[PDB]
Symmetry: D2
Amino acid sequence: MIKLGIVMDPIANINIKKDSSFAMLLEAQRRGYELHYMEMGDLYLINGEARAHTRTLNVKQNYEEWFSFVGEQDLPLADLDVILMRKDPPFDTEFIYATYILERAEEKGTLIVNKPQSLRDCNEKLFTAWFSDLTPETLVTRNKAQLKAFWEKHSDIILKPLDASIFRVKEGDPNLGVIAETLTEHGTRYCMAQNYLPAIKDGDKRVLVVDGEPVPYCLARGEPRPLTESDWKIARQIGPTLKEKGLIFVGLDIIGDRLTEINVTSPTCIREIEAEFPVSITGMLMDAIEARLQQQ
Amino acid sequence: MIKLGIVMDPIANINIKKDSSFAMLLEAQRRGYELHYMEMGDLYLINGEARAHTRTLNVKQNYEEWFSFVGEQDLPLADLDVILMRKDPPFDTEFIYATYILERAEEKGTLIVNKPQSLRDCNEKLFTAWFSDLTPETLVTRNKAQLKAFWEKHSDIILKPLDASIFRVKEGDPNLGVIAETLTEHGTRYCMAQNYLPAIKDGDKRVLVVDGEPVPYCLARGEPRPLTESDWKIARQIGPTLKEKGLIFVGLDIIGDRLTEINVTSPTCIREIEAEFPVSITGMLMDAIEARLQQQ
Amino acid sequence: MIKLGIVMDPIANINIKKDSSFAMLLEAQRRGYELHYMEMGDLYLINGEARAHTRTLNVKQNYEEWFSFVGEQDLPLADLDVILMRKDPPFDTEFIYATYILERAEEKGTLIVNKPQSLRDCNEKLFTAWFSDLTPETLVTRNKAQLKAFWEKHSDIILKPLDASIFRVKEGDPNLGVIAETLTEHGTRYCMAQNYLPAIKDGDKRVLVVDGEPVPYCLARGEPRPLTESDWKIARQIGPTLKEKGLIFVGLDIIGDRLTEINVTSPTCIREIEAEFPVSITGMLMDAIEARLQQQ
Amino acid sequence: MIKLGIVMDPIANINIKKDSSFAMLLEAQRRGYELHYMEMGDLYLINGEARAHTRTLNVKQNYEEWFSFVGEQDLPLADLDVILMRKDPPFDTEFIYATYILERAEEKGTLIVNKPQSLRDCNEKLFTAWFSDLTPETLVTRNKAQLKAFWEKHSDIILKPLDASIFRVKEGDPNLGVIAETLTEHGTRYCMAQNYLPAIKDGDKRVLVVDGEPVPYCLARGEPRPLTESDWKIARQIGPTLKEKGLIFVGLDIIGDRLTEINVTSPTCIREIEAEFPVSITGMLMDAIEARLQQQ
């Protein structure tokens, strides 16, 4: 069978009613995969070989007991067929170090969803710089004077840290200086400004893309909808780049007809769309994984 | 002429007697390049285009006044032929974000020394996992129990943070637990252990590699020496990988016949080797840059 | 009845088999006090008046359910007769701010165990500077050069942060510099050095003092013992100062015949001594509280 | 003569045109005091005795060279007659530890301006809780829900951290939640809210009080003015408490007829008032110090 590993934040603390990682584990188990649970602290590197302490895992939709460990072992990660990296943000240096550990197992034949080097290349907020055609006006800077000028030009902007804490600075806001100071840590940290998009009142849509192919229903933040014509247009333009970079399960954040963020670490909204619509997103994912496992 | 940009820690605070970045700027100026000075805070990104505020720079070996700005401008980074990224460690998330800014200029034709994606791929302590043949016994972990066992097996080890603060834990040291606790931040951060190498008493050599080719004299930490036979062997084995990854100016740290670290951000020791030996390392670098600029 | 309030770290996470705060709540309940539970976040200040959101609490030695809330209210803290400040270390600025909130209730007649201003005056590591006669050789400094010289003079020393992480630097340790660097954060933070006391092998005794009077049995760290002659001597010398400073429940840490630390925030070891010996430490505490409540 | 010590942030970085500490050193030198310079890192504690490395200092109004050291020594702080604690905020735990070091010298007869225990008792933002009659509506809390309700009741409020970064949240501001989240660090840190005072447009006055006596001219933030009738009223009400707490040189911040903050660490504005008006504030301070030195 396929031996599936998952690296994630502690399973004992999720909400199985909405957790997408758990929805993935149930599908994988329904297909008969052997599942191996691990957290960040379980991964290590010894003389260049990637290894982990895993626990063989069993999961079930039981609100009183949704997982159990039926075994425990130390193995080279190269023994697993596929590892799902499902660690939540922040994207910090520890996340980047775990990426090098997963890449040593990847050189030995393991499929990593998503690809380690692409996780380092494709920042969730800065990767939109590669698709400026699709995005709002975006400025990334440490300088208060540039943030002041962007606010003068656009009148109503969003200020966000790169690593929610979104400030909206409308015309007549008294705090642009304090906010710039706070997010740039007095000019020592980069932050991002975008023009505010009023279409947010119509929904912050979450579109999922499975191996480059958009799932046909999205979740407008919480109401499931079919993709509109402009949703299909954004997703078809990014899709090919996600497939070739090995970004196999991606979330795109779309407000109106603007692409605002690209989630490549732990995209969610599977349960919410699946409940209202006849699509098995977890099934599409595992079909795509299995396809990749036979392509090599 | 070539327009050379440099991103570095503030020039007003260096020691021009030993600073290698300054030694590079003097050579570039001696060849007639137009030099453009910038710090991290000068770089920004607007709708996917990389730009910076630069200052045209003039440098001279004058201990009372070694640089002056003769102009100031805002330009797209794609207007510069080559940018030297010479920012010091730490390798943190800000360093990683600046890397994406330099890579947007790189897609537009600018040569970046060293290549942005390789700066993200090649951690200075963890890239040695790709050359385990050349390195000491190395363990990377968050677990105190694994560090305890490595210390039992090797009797005398080095503990270092990934991001100097090197602890030597010899036989009979009472602090392995406190030290593991301190470097792993009670098991939440990865750290690195290696077996101690007694050949350190003979020197921590600094070998420089310019576009894959080892400079023939190194600095044993501070005494300049010709490369020994095993120094040539280590450097010839890494060299090709550095060239193809676009890691054009690299420092390797060698203790005895063991490779311990790979400096790809801001390697130094140019002045120290150049003073005692008939080699112009800065000249080798600029010849290599100019070669790369005509190869495309 | 007496209305007793307690400020503490979350009750849902303690171990009722050894927690001394819980042992205090059971005694108070056995005497019929009305108990009011609060955490740090429940305390606030409005126009100089101290107030809190409390929960009326019920406790019982049940490992499956040891507490329940039977009510909830917002009141001025001046309505409670006595508040036990049982927040764990660190002693940080938040701890210091909560102290000013408790002191506004104290001006209005509430007894605070221990007294707020004394919690600010009496640091657990630095208050020993007032009893140098009883302590080991102690140096507090940010300077590596002074720590090096103390180590030269004493050969075997203890290095500790002021805010466990105790380093022992014996003769021949290779790390004094790295350790000084780490605890002083490269000379920006004070740390403490003391000469090592070999009598630690015979026990790190925990003596409790209730309103200036030593409890006659201590816990040598884990074995309960009667106080020795030198334990009685140390405790009788500190005792009067603790009583007049309103430090009503204190822990003293004694190694051999040396006083090393003074716990004034959350002293423990009640359950361990009480189990093996015929003393009710919680009863001595509540008798002392009740005495203080009738003395005014 | 009097031997005056000063603990301050590095003298090599001040602006002698406006620095009040420097204005104090010039007056002290004009009276013939022997001046001893020290920074935080110079202070230490050995077996309960407070000591420091001092440098004998000479100062002069020379923009190219305003100070020189004419000697260097290690002494017990009890040898100095008076130490001026002139360390800038933040009020952090290091500031609190230095306070215990200065208090050990104070027990041995040294006058400390301002008194160490009062520096711990009198927080610059929270000490206003003792004079609620004079202050605006003030709430101190970690709870977003209480900050939301204060904003509903007052329509236009100020949010500030306890340890500038003042947020004004007017009617219709979209960010109260993000700001509360940012200043309380998601409910783990206390912050302060006050109702906004429109009289700020007429000036944020800085009144100085020397040993309980108000200096008769203030600086409205930058225009020097005589104290108004309500300025005299606020200062006469606080004054006696400052004198008896040994808070010898204090700054009060007054907006309109409201007391907003009490500066007890490093009050300034001496040069600005002294230039426009016939008062020697430094002379009033040294007369008060000399009076205190003969009162014991």
